[PDB]
Design an enzyme around this catalytic site. Structure first.
Site, PDB file in Angstrom:
ATOM      1  N   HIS A   1       0.838  -1.190   0.000  1.00 20.78           N
ATOM      2  CA  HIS A   1       0.000   0.000   0.000  1.00 20.78           C
ATOM      3  C   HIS A   1       0.881   1.251   0.000  1.00 20.78           C
ATOM      4  CE1 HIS A   1      -3.441  -2.547   1.092  1.00 20.78           C
ATOM      5  NE2 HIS A   1      -2.716  -3.039   2.117  1.00 20.78           N
TER       6      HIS A   1
ATOM      7  N   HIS B   1       5.952   6.303   7.263  1.00 19.66           N
ATOM      8  CA  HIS B   1       5.529   6.028   5.907  1.00 19.66           C
ATOM      9  C   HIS B   1       4.966   7.307   5.305  1.00 19.66           C
ATOM     10  CE1 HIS B   1       1.952   5.592   8.340  1.00 19.66           C
ATOM     11  NE2 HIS B   1       1.308   6.125   7.265  1.00 19.66           N
TER      12      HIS B   1
ATOM     13  N   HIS C   1       1.917   8.921   2.296  1.00 19.50           N
ATOM     14  CA  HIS C   1       0.832   8.794   1.340  1.00 19.50           C
ATOM     15  C   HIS C   1       1.085   9.852   0.265  1.00 19.50           C
ATOM     16  CE1 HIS C   1      -1.559   6.545   4.420  1.00 19.50           C
ATOM     17  NE2 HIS C   1      -0.792   7.309   5.233  1.00 19.50           N
TER      18      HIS C   1
ATOM     19  N   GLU D   1      -3.474  13.313   3.097  1.00 18.93           N
ATOM     20  CA  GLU D   1      -4.683  12.792   3.754  1.00 18.93           C
ATOM     21  C   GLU D   1      -5.388  13.941   4.466  1.00 18.93           C
ATOM     22  OE1 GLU D   1      -3.464   9.045   5.752  1.00 18.93           O
ATOM     23  OE2 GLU D   1      -4.493   8.237   3.965  1.00 18.93           O
TER      24      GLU D   1
ATOM     25  N   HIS E   1       3.902  10.358   7.741  1.00 18.39           N
ATOM     26  CA  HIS E   1       3.342   9.972   9.039  1.00 18.39           C
ATOM     27  C   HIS E   1       4.414   9.243   9.831  1.00 18.39           C
ATOM     28  CE1 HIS E   1      -0.966  10.040   7.330  1.00 18.39           C
ATOM     29  NE2 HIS E   1      -0.553  11.245   7.720  1.00 18.39           N
TER      30      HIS E   1
ATOM     31  N   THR F   1      -5.625   5.976   9.515  1.00 17.93           N
ATOM     32  CA  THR F   1      -6.271   6.322   8.259  1.00 17.93           C
ATOM     33  C   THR F   1      -6.366   5.120   7.320  1.00 17.93           C
ATOM     34  OG1 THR F   1      -4.289   6.957   7.102  1.00 17.93           O
ATOM     35  CG2 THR F   1      -5.398   8.707   8.422  1.00 17.93           C
TER      36      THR F   1
HETATM   37  N1  LIG Z   1      -1.815   6.365   8.256  1.00 15.60           N
HETATM   38  S1  LIG Z   1      -1.587   6.170   9.802  1.00 15.60           S
HETATM   39  O1  LIG Z   1      -0.487   6.963  10.269  1.00 15.60           O
HETATM   40  O2  LIG Z   1      -2.832   6.276  10.521  1.00 15.60           O
HETATM   41  C1  LIG Z   1      -0.997   4.553  10.110  1.00 15.60           C
HETATM   42  C2  LIG Z   1      -0.697   4.197  11.423  1.00 15.60           C
HETATM   43  F1  LIG Z   1      -0.978   5.057  12.430  1.00 15.60           F
HETATM   44  C3  LIG Z   1      -0.128   2.993  11.742  1.00 15.60           C
HETATM   45  F2  LIG Z   1       0.151   2.682  13.014  1.00 15.60           F
HETATM   46  C4  LIG Z   1       0.243   2.058  10.750  1.00 15.60           C
HETATM   47  C5  LIG Z   1      -0.064   2.360   9.400  1.00 15.60           C
HETATM   48  C6  LIG Z   1      -0.661   3.584   9.150  1.00 15.60           C
HETATM   49  F3  LIG Z   1      -0.957   3.839   7.866  1.00 15.60           F
HETATM   50  N2  LIG Z   1       0.359   1.522   8.388  1.00 15.60           N
HETATM   51  C7  LIG Z   1       1.052   2.036   7.205  1.00 15.60           C
HETATM   52  C8  LIG Z   1       0.226   2.031   5.980  1.00 15.60           C
HETATM   53  C9  LIG Z   1       0.290   3.082   5.032  1.00 15.60           C
HETATM   54  C10 LIG Z   1      -0.486   2.973   3.890  1.00 15.60           C
HETATM   55  C11 LIG Z   1      -1.339   1.867   3.714  1.00 15.60           C
HETATM   56  C12 LIG Z   1      -1.396   0.849   4.662  1.00 15.60           C
HETATM   57  C13 LIG Z   1      -0.615   0.925   5.807  1.00 15.60           C
HETATM   58  C14 LIG Z   1       0.641   0.138   8.559  1.00 15.60           C
HETATM   59  C15 LIG Z   1       1.518  -0.125   9.712  1.00 15.60           C
HETATM   60  S2  LIG Z   1       1.149   0.653  11.233  1.00 15.60           S
HETATM   61  O3  LIG Z   1       2.413   1.055  11.832  1.00 15.60           O
HETATM   62  O4  LIG Z   1       0.252  -0.127  12.019  1.00 15.60           O
HETATM   63 ZN   LIG Z   2      -0.396   7.171   7.195  1.00 17.26          ZN
END
Ligand SMILES: NS(=O)(=O)c1c(F)c(F)c2c(c1F)N(Cc1ccccc1)CCS2(=O)=O
Ligand SMILES: [Zn+2]
Length: 257
Positions: free
Chosen positions: A62, A92, A94, A104, A117, A196
């Site tokens: 993703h 990571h 977006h 986002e 993030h 998100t």
């Molecule tokens: N966007 S966010 O910051 O709320 C967010 C988050 F807080 C997370 F804790 C995690 C996310 C995560 F997005 N992901 C990373 C991701 C990005 C893009 C598509 C899927 C997963 C997967 C691993 S995680 O560390 O559990």
């Molecule tokens: Zn994120």
């Protein structure tokens, strides 16, 4: 038929597997700068990343994740709106297919080209998996990216992406310093929200920095050459991996400035 970011399986569909998608504290949101309340009791944000130990970078199908050793208080976030201390586990991004979209959160409806993030978990809960079950389990520091001058501290990330092109690829990624991804100012907005991404758990204190960082057109183009597919599958470019703004409902966004 798992969740993703397409016509077939994207954000409008997530509620069927994850009904919390329609919950009371979902993220991201539009930050209405005129409506956000300055809160003089908010503290400066304490970002202590000097001992961070990056380990690895992963294409998870993703986005890509840069992971850190979170088995001791190395890299921590505290202060700001937070009580206690939060350990960095990963970051990571977006991003969009075009420079005019990809973030986002939005600011007065403005979309940035991308959003970083930095994910941290509250050490009172012992591990990340326990933290995500708690309303104050995570603190995510969000940083907007606009396209302009290059961000030198991003280039190491950019340069490794060809080695993790497809879903499930991972590469050693030691000695990366996340301080090189921060803007000058730590002025921020904050509100209670959610992951998100599925499972969309309502466990996050969001801290979104006012000041974007600048990245070059060439840096963001390399993000867009990643693939959502696994090796040996048809190519589907990793772009537009953002959830749109969700209803604010019964929340107040606070400004530190
Ligand atoms: N966007 S966010 O910051 O709320 C967010 C988050 F807080 C997370 F804790 C995690 C996310 C995560 F997005 N992901 C990373 C991701 C990005 C893009 C598509 C899927 C997963 C997967 C691993 S995680 O560390 O559990
Ligand atoms: Zn994120």
């Amino acid at each position: 038929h798992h969740w993703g970011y397409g016509k077939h399986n994207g954000p409008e569909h997530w509620h069927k597997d994850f009904p919390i998608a329609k919950g009371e504290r979902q993220s991201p949101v539009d930050i209405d700068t005129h409506t956000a309340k300055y809160d003089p009791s908010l503290k400066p944000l304490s970002v202590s990343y000097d001992q961070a130990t990056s380990l690895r970078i992963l294409n998870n199908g993703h986005a890509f994740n840069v992971e850190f050793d979170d088995s001791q208080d190395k890299a921590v976030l505290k202060g700001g709106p937070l009580d206690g201390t939060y350990r960095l586990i990963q970051f990571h991004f977006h991003w969009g297919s075009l420079d005019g979209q990809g973030s986002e959160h939005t600011v007065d409806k403005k979309k940035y080209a991308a959003e970083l993030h930095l994910v941290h978990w509250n050490t009172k809960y012992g591990d990340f998996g326990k933290a995500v079950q708690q309303p104050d389990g995570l603190a995510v520091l969000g940083i907007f990216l606009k396209v302009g001058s290059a961000k030198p501290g991003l280039q190491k990330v950019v340069d490794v992406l060809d080695s993790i092109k497809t879903k499930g690829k991972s590469a050693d990624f030691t000695n990366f310093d996340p301080r090189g991804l921060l803007p000058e100012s730590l002025d921020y907005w904050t509100y209670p929200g959610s992951l998100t991404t599925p499972p969309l758990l309502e466990c996050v204190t969001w801290i979104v920095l006012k000041e974007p960082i600048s990245v070059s057109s060439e840096q963001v183009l390399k993000f867009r050459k990643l693939n959502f597919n696994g090796e040996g599958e048809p190519e589907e470019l990793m772009v537009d991996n953002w959830r749109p703004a969700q209803p604010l409902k019964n929340r107040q966004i606070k400004a530190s400035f």
